[PDB]
Design an enzyme around this catalytic site. Structure first.
Site, PDB file in Angstrom:
ATOM      1  N   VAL A  76     -15.995 -13.499  48.897  1.00  0.00           N
ATOM      2  CA  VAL A  76     -14.876 -14.251  48.332  1.00  0.00           C
ATOM      3  C   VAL A  76     -13.833 -13.305  47.746  1.00  0.00           C
ATOM      4  N   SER A  77     -12.558 -13.682  47.843  1.00  0.00           N
ATOM      5  CA  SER A  77     -11.463 -12.880  47.304  1.00  0.00           C
ATOM      6  C   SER A  77     -10.446 -13.781  46.629  1.00  0.00           C
ATOM      7  CB  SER A  77     -10.780 -12.067  48.401  1.00  0.00           C
ATOM      8  N   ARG A  78     -10.223 -13.559  45.338  1.00  0.00           N
ATOM      9  CA  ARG A  78      -9.205 -14.332  44.647  1.00  0.00           C
ATOM     10  C   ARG A  78      -7.830 -14.079  45.235  1.00  0.00           C
ATOM     11  N   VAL A  79      -7.614 -12.885  45.779  1.00  0.00           N
ATOM     12  CA  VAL A  79      -6.258 -12.435  46.064  1.00  0.00           C
ATOM     13  C   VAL A  79      -5.587 -13.316  47.110  1.00  0.00           C
ATOM     14  N   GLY A  80      -6.128 -13.356  48.318  1.00  0.00           N
ATOM     15  CA  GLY A  80      -5.500 -14.152  49.356  1.00  0.00           C
ATOM     16  C   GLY A  80      -4.456 -13.405  50.176  1.00  0.00           C
TER      17      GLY A  80
END
Lengths: 136, 157, 284, 157, 73, 73
Positions: E7-11
Site C-alpha cells: 500500500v502507498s499513501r502517495v498515489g
C-alpha cells in the site's frame, strides 16, 4: 396449412403446436392425414416422419416414435411414447432389479463439486482437534 | 493446571477430585470433573471385572461424546450416524443420569434426598449399559432416584 | 496457541468459511436452475386426466378391471432415495412418516411390499431392512422415463398379478420457496377423479379397438407422469433445502472465530505476559 | 472520541468545524498536531490559506521530527493556551493527536526514567498522566472546554 | 509482490496524463480476478462475463509477468 | 502411546530374523489406521476395498491388546 387448435406435445416436451390444417401421418392401423371438419376420434400411430402442412403453408415431415394422438371435437393434439414400449424389455429390467436388489449395485451422480465438497468436509473437519483448547 | 502449586499437588497428591465449571456451568448440582478424577486404589481385581469393566465402558462413552462433540458443533447433528446418534442419546442421558438428591441437601434446594446403595448402582450399570429402559425420559434422569424411583417419575415423569 | 494453534485454528476457520460460501453460492445456483427447470411437468398428464375423465362419463360405465386393481391382500408404497449430499433432514421426515405408516400396516396387519428408488432410502430400507421387491438408483439430475420404465414394469407385475390391493407413493411436495411439505401418496387405489366424466362426453368417440388397451396402457402412461413430477419437486426442493442449510452452517463458525480471537487475545495478553515477566526477568 | 481515518478527509470535517465555530459562535479554538508526517501539515497550512479561515486558530505542530521531552511536554502548552480562552471565559474545543504516541512516549520516558515500566510496558503511572489529560478538559462555570482526539489505534486490541 | 497487500499513501500525482489516465482498471479488476477467481476451484460452468473477464484477467496477469534482469520503456 | 509419537534411532538391529522378519506391516497399519481415520469423517464415502483395508485396520487395532499386569511369552 394450419387448422384451428392443434399441438404435438408431451409433458416432457411439446413437439409442435398451433394449428395444422393438413397433416400427412400414417395411422397405426390406417391412412392418416389432417384436414378440417372431420369428427372427433382417438387413435395411435406407428413411428415415422409426419409431413404436415401448417400455417402459411409450412409443411414438414416429423419423425414419430409412434404413440396415441387424438382429436377432440374442435381440438387436435398429439401424444406419443417417446419410445414405443418394448415387449419383454423391462422384464430384463425386473431381472436387473432382482439381481441388483439381491446382488448389490449402484449408480452415481457426477458432480465434481460434490467430490471436491467431500474433500472439503473431511479435509475441513480433518485436523480439527481445536475443540479441546476451546473453553465453555 | 500448570500451576506448580498444582504440580506439587498431584505430585504429593494422595487422593484427589476435580470439578467442571462447565458441568457446574451445566447447572449440574454435583459438578465434579468425573472424566478427570481417578482412584489409584481402584484395582479391577479389587473391583472385580464388572466394576473395572463397566467404568471403563462409561469412560469409553465419555471419550466418544467428547469425541464427536466437535463434529456436531461443526456440523450440528444433521449427519448423525445412526449408531452414533443413539450413543449420544445415551450420553446426555448418562450425564443427566448421574444426578440424584441428598437428604441433608434440602437446605440449598428445598428438595431432600437420600443415602444410596451400591448394589442398586451396580444395577444401574447394567440397565444403562443396556440402555435397558428405552423410553426412559432424559429430564427424568437428572437429580433423580433409583430406576425404581426414576420409574415412578417415569410413571408421572 | 502461539497462533500455531491459534492462527492454525484461524486458517482452519478461513478455509472453512471459504468452503462455506462456495457451498452456499454454488448450491444456490443449482437450486435456482432446479426451480426454473422443474416447471414443465404438467402438460401431458393434465391432458391425461381431462381426456381420461371426459371419456369416463358413460364410457367408464363399461368396465373397471383396472380400477379394481388388486384385492385387499398386500399393501404397497413407492419410494425414492437420494443421490444428493448433505441435502437436509429429509429422509428423516420421510423415512419417519414412512415408519408411521408401516406401523399402521402392521396395525392393519395387511400384507405389503416395498420398492425403492435411489441410494438413500435404499439405505433407510436396506439399512432398515424390510420386504422390498427391487430398487432403482442413480438416474441423477436427468431422470429418464425409459430409466423409469423397467422399474415401472416390474411395478405393473402387481396390479397385473393383482397381488397387492393398495400401494402408496411418497415424495415431499413443495411448500414452495419457504418450504416443501412432506408428501405421501395413496396408490394402487383408483384416481377417483369425478370432475371430467361429470358431463356425458360430447365429442364423438370412435374407438377402432376397445379402449381397454388405452386403459391399461394409457393409464400406465399417465400415472407415470405423476411419478416423474413428484420426483422433480423432490429434486428442486432438494437443491434449495441444501442451499438454505449452507448459509446457517456457514454463519455459526464465525462466532467460534470470535472466541478464538479472544484466544489469541488471552494469548496476545499471554505472550505479552510471559514475555513481560521474562522481561523483568532479563532485567533481573 | 474519534473513529474514521485516512481517506476520510477529516480536514473536511475540521473545516466544517471552522465554519461551525465562527458561524455558530464567537468562540474559537485551535488544535495542534504532534508526531506527524510533515507534508500533511504544510498541506494543511496551504489548506488553511485555501480555507483562509486559519486566522481564528493556530498551533505549533510536533511532526515527530522531535525529541520526546518536547513531545510529552507539549500537552501542558495547549492546556495553558486554551486556558487563555476558557480563562477568557470563552469556551471551545480542540482536536487531539495520537495518544498512543503520547502515552507510549510515556514509556520511552520511563525507560528513560530507568523506572520499572507499567505492565505491557506502559508508563508505570501512565494512568496518572491520563489523569492530567482527561482531567484537564472541562466546561467551566464560565468557560467550556470540549475536544476530540484520535489516538494511534494499536492493532485494534 | 504482495498483490495489493502492499500500500502507498502517495498515489499517482506524478503520473503521466496518459499513464496516469489509463491505469485504473488494473487495480480494481485485477483485484477482481484474484478475488473472483476463487469460485473456479469449486465452481464450474460459469457464465461468460466470468469467462472473458476471467480470461483477460488470468492471461492478462501472464502479460504482467516480467523477466528477471530486464529493462522497460 | 502413538505410532510415530515415539521413535528411536537405534532401529531394528536388535530385531530377530523371525522377529525382524515378520514385523513390517505395523507402520502402514499405523498409517492405515491413522490414515484410515481420514475418511471416517466423511461418513459412508468408501467401498469395500477401503472397507477391507479399514476392517483390517480395526482388526489390527483389536490385535493390539495388553493386560495391566502380564508377563510376555
Amino acid at each position: 396449412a394450419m387448422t384451428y387448435h392443434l399441438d404435438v406435445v408431451s409433458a416432457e416436451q411439446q413437439m409442435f403446436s398451433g394449428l395444422v390444417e393438413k397433416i400427412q401421418v400414417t395411422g397405426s392401423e390406417g391412412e392418416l392425414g389432417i384436414y378440417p371438419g372431420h369428427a372427433p376420434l382417438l387413435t395411435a400411430i406407428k413411428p415415422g416422419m409426419i409431413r404436415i402442412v401448417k400455417q402459411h403453408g409450412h409443411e414438414e415431415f416429423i419423425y414419430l416414435s409412434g404413440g396415441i394422438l387424438e382429436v377432440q371435437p374442435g381440438n387436435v393434439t398429439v401424444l406419443a411414447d417417446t419410445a414405443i414400449r418394448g415387449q419383454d424389455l423391462d422384464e430384463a429390467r425386473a431381472m436387473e432389479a432382482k439381481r441388483k436388489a439381491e446382488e448389490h449395485i449402484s449408480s452415481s451422480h457426477g458432480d465434481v463439486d460434490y467430490a471436491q465438497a467431500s474433500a472439503e468436509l473431511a479435509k475441513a473437519i480433518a485436523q480439527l482437534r481445536v475443540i479441546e483448547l476451546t473453553k465453555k | 493446571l500448570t500451576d506448580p502449586s498444582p504440580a506439587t499437588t498431584f505430585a504429593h497428591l494422595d487422593a484427589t477430585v476435580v470439578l467442571s465449571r462447565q458441568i457446574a456451568s451445566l447447572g449440574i448440582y454435583p459438578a465434579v470433573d468425573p472424566l478427570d478424577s481417578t482412584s489409584r486404589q481402584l484395582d479391577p481385581l479389587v473391583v472385580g471385572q464388572e466394576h473395572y469393566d463397566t467404568a471403563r465402558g462409561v469412560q469409553s462413552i465419555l471419550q466418544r461424546y467428547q469425541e464427536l462433540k466437535d463434529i456436531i458443533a461443526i456440523l450440528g447433528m444433521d449427519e448423525l450416524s445412526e449408531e452414533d446418534k443413539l450413543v449420544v442419546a445415551r450420553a446426555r442421558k448418562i450425564q443427566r443420569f448421574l444426578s440424584q438428591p441428598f437428604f441433608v441437601a434440602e437446605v440449598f434446594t428445598g428438595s431432600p434426598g437420600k443415602y444410596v446403595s451400591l448394589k442398586d448402582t451396580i444395577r444401574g450399570f447394567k440397565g444403562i449399559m443396556e440402555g435397558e429402559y428405552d423410553h426412559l425420559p432424559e429430564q427424568a434422569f437428572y437429580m433423580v432416584g433409583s430406576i425404581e424411583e426414576a420409574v415412578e417419575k417415569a410413571k408421572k415423569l | 496457541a502461539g497462533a500455531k494453534d491459534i492462527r492454525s485454528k484461524i486458517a482452519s476457520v478461513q478455509n472453512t468459511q471459504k468452503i462455506t460460501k462456495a457451498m452456499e453460492m454454488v448450491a444456490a445456483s443449482k437450486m435456482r436452475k432446479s426451480q426454473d427447470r422443474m416447471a414443465a411437468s404438467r402438460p401431458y398428464a393434465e391432458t391425461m386426466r381431462k381426456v381420461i375423465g371426459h371419456l369416463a362419463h358413460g364410457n367408464l360405465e363399461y368396465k373397471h378391471p383396472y380400477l379394481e386393481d388388486r384385492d385387499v391382500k398386500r399393501v404397497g408404497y413407492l419410494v425414492v432415495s437420494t443421490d444428493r449430499g448433505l441435502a437436509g433432514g429429509l429422509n428423516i421426515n420421510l423415512f419417519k412418516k414412512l415408519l408411521a405408516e408401516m406401523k399402521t400396516w402392521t396395525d392393519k396387519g395387511v400384507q405389503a411390499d416395498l420398492a425403492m428408488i435411489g441410494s438413500k432410502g435404499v439405505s433407510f430400507f436396506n439399512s432398515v431392512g424390510g420386504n422390498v421387491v427391487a430398487q432403482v438408483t442413480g438416474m441423477g439430475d436427468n431422470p429418464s422415463l425409459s430409466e423409469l420404465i423397467g422399474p415401472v414394469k416390474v411395478m405393473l407385475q402387481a396390479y397385473d398379478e393383482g397381488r397387492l390391493d393398495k400401494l402408496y407413493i411418497v415424495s415431499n411436495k413443495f411448500i414452495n420457496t419457504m418450504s416443501q411439505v412432506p408428501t405421501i401418496s395413496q396408490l394402487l387405489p383408483l384416481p377417483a377423479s369425478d370432475d371430467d366424466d361429470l358431463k356425458h362426453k360430447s365429442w364423438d368417440y370412435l374407438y377402432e379397438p376397445d379402449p381397454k388397451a388405452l386403459l391399461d396402457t394409457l393409464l400406465r402412461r399417465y400415472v407415470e407422469s405423476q411419478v416423474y413430477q413428484g420426483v422433480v419437486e423432490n429434486l428442486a426442493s432438494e437443491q434449495a433445502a441444501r442451499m438454505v442449510a449452507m448459509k446457517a452452517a456457514t454463519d455459526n463458525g464465525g462466532s467460534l472465530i470470535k472466541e478464538l480471537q479472544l484466544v489469541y487475545n488471552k494469548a496476545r495478553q499471554a505472550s505479552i505476559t510471559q514475555e513481560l515477566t521474562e522481561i523483568v526477568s532479563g532485567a533481573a | 472520541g474519534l473513529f474514521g481515518g485516512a481517506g476520510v478527509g477529516k480536514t473536511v470535517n475540521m473545516m466544517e468545524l471552522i465554519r461551525n465555530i465562527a458561524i455558530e459562535h464567537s468562540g474559537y479554538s485551535v488544535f495542534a498536531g504532534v508526531g506527524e508526517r510533515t507534508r500533511e501539515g504544510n498541506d494543511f497550512y496551504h489548506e488553511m490559506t485555501d480555507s483562509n479561515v486559519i486566522d481564528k486558530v493556530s498551533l505549533v505542530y510536533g511532526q515527530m521530527n522531535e525529541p520526546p521531552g518536547n513531545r510529552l511536554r507539549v500537552a501542558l502548552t495547549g492546556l495553558t493556551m486554551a486556558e487563555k480562552f476558557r480563562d477568557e471565559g470563552r469556551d471551545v474545543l480542540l482536536f487531539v493527536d495520537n495518544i498512543y504516541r503520547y502515552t507510549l512516549a510515556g514509556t520511552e520516558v520511563s525507560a528513560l526514567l530507568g523506572r520499572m515500566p507499567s505492565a505491557v510496558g506502559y508508563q508505570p503511572t501512565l494512568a496518572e498522566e491520563m489523569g492530567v489529560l482527561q482531567e484537564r478538559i472541562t466546561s467551566t462555570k464560565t468557560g467550556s472546554i470540549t475536544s476530540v482526539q484520535a489516538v494511534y489505534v494499536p492493532a485494534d486490541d | 509482490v504482495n498483490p495489493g497487500i502492499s500500500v502507498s499513501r502517495v498515489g499517482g500525482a506524478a503520473q503521466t496524463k496518459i499513464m496516469k489516465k489509463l491505469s485504473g482498471g488494473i487495480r480494481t479488476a485485477l483485484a477482481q480476478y484474484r478475488e473472483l477467481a476463487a469460485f473456479s476451484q469449486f465452481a464450474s460452468d460459469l457464465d461468460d462475463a466470468t469467462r472473458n473477464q476471467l480470461d483477460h484477467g488470468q492471461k492478462v496477469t501472464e502479460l504482467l509477468k516480467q523477466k528477471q534482469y530486464a529493462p522497460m520503456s
